[PDB]
């Protein structure tokens, strides 16, 4: 069965990589050498992604110290080979990937059976050079990675020939043309920016005049402006008339890699951080010296925090720079502080640095199988030294850092016992239990975060597990589908680290204004910080605001396919998450939606309204009409579309179906109304030959002249419009047949439609008086009510996406737009976010590296990093958090994000007003609570009588006619104000303590 992908399991990853990359991945056998923490973080991500086979190799026994980052090892397994025991657990992650153990690597020819080989820290450099040489000459792709405490690297070698097919993965750019001059200059319609670059390739279509320009030939692009580019002389093709759509095309790029032996001495660096460009050549010699150290010392790495071993490693690194003078260059001496730190931390095994490289490397493993995205070329070195605490508080020396016979000994080796204790005793709030939420929990389980006496974790997520979650949420298994994420994820991580057994409080609650009884003042005050694992921006902007109010650190994180980012929000220091986020994508114009689509995004958004009109809103009106006493006379003065609401009800009684055959009929008739009649009406007003005012064609530029649709049961999109239409309608009315009988059969739907009379089209108070009168009494229509449909995009059996895609495509045929299939329609109408475990895992590593800085109460902003990453390029950026901007009123300075006014007691309005005047020199002009304006200076004098003598709680009831509830202890208020000169001033909010 070659060439089949499970679209429900790989749904979200399939929007990142696509079909061809994944058909090639299932053709690839991958081998991983070394199954400590870094090993599994790769295998986990590679198995989840889906290769032909995963083979693992680590015949060395499990020690307690391995658990510092091996989430697949427990204290049960000690004394047993890591390959054997780990391999049974990876097998659970994906049923479609066999996982095998290599029992012995006695010979380098055993590598022949693998397309990719991944060597980790367990493999020595002599073996890595030999393995790499065999791989390079044999055509096997080679990757390697090492982490030494807060340090790490990765190497990539794909041979003399490797062809990148898609260098970015971006959906290709495309746009409409307005002029192509004889020289090749192409101007864009309605001054929209093409979004192209020099060296891109475009094909054209629909360009009248330059006929041969549209045959699929490619054209190299030289960018002139943001709204224009050039493609070369087009005189030969003819002369431009009108129309045109250019479409970017990705052309293959061939590339070559140097072997490891070659790159050890002449390395090609991909950088991770702008302010650490120099450290790469330094750590290149260092990581080599560590291997040389171990061969001098019976295989042992330097002793932790030992100056004798570090002083030798300096010496070893110096001899290398004489042997490899290209690396450092000239004038560049060895950085002895940086190599001593490397030696201090060689034993170190840090969760965050592992999850980082676990994703980065695994992604490169995937690039190697597919040719999708641009591989790393060829070394990358990385370190997060600023995660180290202040040595004044948590000093590091040979005692404080020694092993204690625990799973955390390798973390204690870097940070010391005191800090590790302080982590354990921290109190955290995790919002979300998805891909990021899962990796977060697993990192905290390795750190022991929350396991201390006075520490705890709180995780909440109201959502349940579904099949596609399993592609990147690795704490969930098939049998857990339909269960609650947070609860199962809490169990899962306790099985990993029983030190948390009973310290995670898995809740099921949403985080909004309605759950502030559960997440109340005392909850927020006790926390040390908050972590965000959420997708949707409204809940994140809420949590962000609760953190500003309670002054808690917040760690935000997010991925968009291969793209990722991290943000640190620090009280009295940095911006917040809402402070600066970029605007959303523009909405579709109503006229474009209604009458003039030119893009499948428009047809899909039209089909989604129509799905909501037929099968959800119609049945809500009818059911209110049949139950609520005054719904008839309510509508007459309450709704906007009174005409359509009454129409909907009338139609639901006229056209009440009795068998599935009546539904098929209904669907065929709606086909005519929507894809035949309404187009003819449109063309009646604006014929194909219509002229505008000024007198240039009406259908021109962004407008496509439609053609009415003759129904054809053999057209797939016509057939499925009537099948899904018939079945959705039948559901409303509780009618038998539906899709649980069999698969849909064109011939039996044909028999019904063939005998139908279908009406020809003719160019088309008292309206409502009829509708109102022609409706019967509800009492008449005993025992009957519709069941409205609830749009779920991830049940394939339910016909929802089947209708939207057929409806969307039928309308695409009207306007001559290329049809789309279910997976694409499901992406736009579902508003789906592409997501793969590689980025997720990686971003979570960075966030936990920034967590150490919170645990040390870092107040220096330059210590923190906001990360950006685009694993497709690949690109790693790290910036300093943005400082909270400062305001000023009456010479007094304040933090525009974190400061506020605090008034104890339920205060009288005029008391507040004069209180501000005699304290801050401010004159309140406006005052609101929530969405209610409680006081304003433009109010009439009689309005101000009501309010000025009232306490704020009674004032709230006066305005909203509904009072504050008893559990409320505080009230935020927003105000405008003027300073001593009467000039306006920006001022912070007010907190009232009741």
């Amino acid at each position: 069965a070659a060439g089949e992908i499970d679209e429900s399991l790989y749904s979200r990853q399939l929007y990142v990589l696509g079909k061809e990359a994944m058909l090639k991945m299932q053709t690839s056998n991958v081998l991983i050498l070394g199954l400590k923490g870094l090993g599994v973080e790769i295998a986990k991500n590679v198995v989840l992604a889906g290769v032909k086979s995963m083979t693992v190799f680590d015949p060395e026994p499990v020690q307690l110290a391995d658990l510092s980052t091996q989430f697949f090892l427990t204290e049960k397994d000690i004394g047993q080979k890591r390959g054997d025991v780990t391999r049974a657990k990876l097998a659970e992650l994906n049923a479609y990937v066999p996982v095998n153990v290599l029992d012995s690597l006695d010979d380098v020819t055993q590598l022949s059976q693998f397309q990719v080989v991944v060597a980790t820290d367990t493999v020595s450099l002599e073996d890595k050079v030999k393995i790499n040489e065999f791989c390079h000459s044999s055509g096997i792709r080679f990757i390697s990675s090492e982490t030494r405490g807060l340090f790490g690297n990765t190497f990539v070698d794909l041979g003399d020939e490797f062809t990148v097919l898609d260098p970015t993965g971006e959906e290709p750019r495309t746009g409409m043309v307005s002029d192509i001059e004889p020289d090749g200059t192409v101007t864009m319609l309605d001054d929209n920016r093409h979004g192209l670059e020099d060296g891109n390739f475009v094909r054209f279509s629909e360009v009248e005049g330059l006929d041969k320009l549209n045959d699929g030939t490619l054209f190299k692009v030289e960018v002139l402006g943001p709204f224009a580019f050039r493609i070369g002389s087009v005189k030969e093709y003819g002369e431009y008339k009108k129309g045109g759509i250019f479409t970017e095309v990705k052309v293959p790029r061939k590339i070559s890699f140097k072997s490891l032996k070659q790159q050890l001495s002449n390395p090609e660096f991909v950088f991770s951080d702008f302010a650490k460009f120099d450290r790469a050549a330094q750590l290149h010699l260092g990581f080599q010296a560590l291997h040389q150290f171990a061969v001098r010392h019976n295989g042992e790495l330097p002793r932790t925090m030992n100056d004798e071993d570090a002083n030798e490693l300096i010496k070893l690194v110096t001899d290398l720079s004489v042997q490899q003078p290209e690396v450092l260059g000239e004038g560049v001496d060895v950085n002895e502080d940086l190599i001593k730190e490397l030696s201090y931390q060689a034993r170190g095994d840090i969760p965050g640095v592992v999850a980082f490289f676990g994703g980065l490397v695994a992604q490169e493993v995937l690039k190697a199988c597919s040719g999708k995205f641009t591989p790393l070329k060829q070394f990358m070195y990385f370190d997060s030294l600023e995660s180290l605490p202040d040595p004044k508080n948590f000093p590091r020396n040979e005692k404080t850092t020694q092993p204690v016979n625990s799973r955390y000994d390798n973390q204690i080796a870097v940070f010391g016992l005191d800090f590790q204790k302080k982590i354990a005793n921290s109190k955290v709030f995790l919002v979300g239990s998805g891909a990021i939420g899962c990796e977060m929990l697993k990192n905290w389980a390795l750190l022991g975060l929350g396991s201390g006496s006075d520490g705890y974790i709180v995780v909440t997520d109201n959502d349940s597990i579904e099949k596609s979650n399993l592609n990147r949420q690795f704490l969930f298994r098939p049998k857990d589908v339909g269960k609650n994420k947070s609860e199962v994820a809490a169990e899962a991580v306790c099985a990993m680290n029983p030190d948390l057994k009973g310290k995670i409080n898995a809740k099921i609650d949403k985080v909004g204004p309605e759950t502030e009884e559960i997440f109340n003042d005392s909850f927020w005050e006790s926390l040390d910080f908050v972590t965000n694992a959420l997708d949707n921006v409204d809940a994140r902007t809420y949590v962000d605001r609760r953190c500003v109010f309670y002054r808690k650190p917040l760690l935000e994180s997010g991925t968009l396919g291969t793209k990722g980012n991290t943000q640190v929000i620090i009280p009295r220091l940095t911006e917040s998450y809402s402070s600066s986020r970029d605007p959303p994508e523009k909405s579709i114009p109503l006229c474009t939606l209604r009458s003039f689509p030119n893009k499948i995004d428009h047809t899909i958004a039209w089909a989604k309204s129509l799905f909501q009109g037929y099968f959800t809103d119609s049945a809500e009106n009818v059911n209110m009409y049949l139950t609520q006493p005054n719904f008839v006379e309510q509508t007459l003065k309450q709704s906007g579309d009174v005409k359509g609401v009454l129409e909907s009800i009338s139609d639901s009684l006229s056209s009440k179906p009795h068998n599935f055959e009546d539904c098929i009929k209904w669907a065929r008739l709606e086909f005519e109304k929507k894809f035949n009649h309404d187009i003819k009406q449109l063309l009646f007003n604006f014929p194909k030959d219509a002229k505008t005012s000024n007198g240039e064609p009406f259908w021109s530029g962004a407008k496509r002249a439609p053609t009415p649709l003759e129904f054809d049961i053999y057209n797939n999109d016509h057939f499925h419009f009537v099948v899904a239409g018939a079945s959705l309608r039948a559901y409303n009315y509780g009618i038998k047949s539906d899709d649980s009988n069999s698969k849909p059969n064109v011939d039996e739907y044909k028999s019904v439609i063939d005998h139908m009379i279908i009406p020809e089209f003719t160019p088309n108070s008292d309206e409502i008086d009829q509708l109102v009168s022609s409706l019967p009494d509800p009492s008449t229509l005993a025992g009957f009510k519709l069941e409205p449909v609830d749009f779920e995009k991830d049940d394939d059996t339910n016909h929802h996406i089947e209708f939207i895609t057929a409806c969307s495509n039928c309308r695409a045929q009207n306007y001559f737009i290329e049809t789309a299939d279910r997976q694409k329609t499901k992406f736009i109408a579902g508003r789906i976010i592409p997501a793969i475990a590689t980025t997720t895992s990686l971003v979570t590593g960075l966030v936990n590296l920034e967590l150490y800085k919170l645990i040390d109460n870092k107040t220096d902003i330059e210590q923190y990093k906001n990360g950006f990453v685009n694993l497709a390029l690949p690109f790693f950026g790290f910036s300093e958090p943005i400082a909270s901007p400062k305001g000023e009123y009456n010479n007094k300075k304040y933090d525009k994000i974190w400061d506020r006014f605090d008034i104890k007691g339920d205060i009288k309005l005029s008391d507040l007003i004069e209180h501000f005047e005699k304290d801050e020199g401010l004159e309140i002009t406006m005052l609101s609570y929530g969405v209610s304006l409680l006081y304003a200076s433009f109010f009439p004098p009689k309005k101000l009588k009501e309010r000025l003598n009232l306490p704020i709680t009674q004032l709230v009831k006066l305005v909203t006619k509904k009072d504050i509830p008893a559990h409320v202890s505080t009230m935020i208020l927003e105000i405008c104000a003027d300073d001593k000169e009467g000039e306006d001033v920006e001022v912070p909010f007010i907190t009232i303590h009741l």
Binding site: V537, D538, R545, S578, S579, S580, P583, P584, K586, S587, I588, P589, L590, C591, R594, S595, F596, G640, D641, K643, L682, N685, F686, A690, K691, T692, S693, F698, P885, T925, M926, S928, G930, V931, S932, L933, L934, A936, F938, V959, T960, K961, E974, I975, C976, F989
Partner: protein
């Protein structure tokens, strides 16, 4: 840059009284600062010059990232305003940014009543009437203004 969206509304509302837009009124409900009641005088020398037109304006949850929703409450014969009061305006959808205001939206509608564009129509029947039978289209607009837009 930012602020809470009641604070934003507060600031915009205060300036709408501090200096109003000629010919337009715009006041929110003290119960709900998101919902506004607007009235617009018909511009000079347009077919709407005699009447007053009432609008409803709602500020959504993610304002000013998301644009204001608008609905004409008065019946009007106009190419870009449909039977249900829905409006076609570039600033509402394509040309919206967080930097813009309610003040911007209201001035755009006022500019639209003075200068329809039936080349991008919403009410298709009346746009082809505006294209092909302009003087008669303005006659029906002046008539509907007298029938449905009260007075003043």
């Amino acid at each position: 840059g930012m602020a809470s969206l009641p604070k934003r509304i507060i600031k915009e509302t205060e300036k709408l009284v501090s200096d109003p837009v000629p010919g337009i009124t715009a006041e929110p409900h003290d119960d709900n600062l998101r919902y506004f009641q607007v009235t617009i005088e018909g511009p000079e020398q347009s077919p709407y010059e005699d009447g007053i037109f009432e609008l409803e304006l709602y500020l959504p949850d993610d304002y000013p990232m998301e644009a204001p929703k608008v609905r004409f409450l008065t019946k009007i014969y106009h190419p870009n305003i449909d039977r249900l009061g829905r409006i076609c305006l570039d600033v509402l959808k394509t040309n919206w940014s967080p930097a813009l205001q309610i003040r911007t939206v209201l001035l755009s509608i006022q500019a639209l009543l003075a200068s329809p564009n039936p080349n991008d129509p919403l009410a298709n029947d009346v746009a082809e009437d505006w294209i092909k039978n302009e003087q008669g289209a303005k006659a029906k607009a002046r008539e509907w203004t007298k029938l449905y837009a009260k007075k003043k």
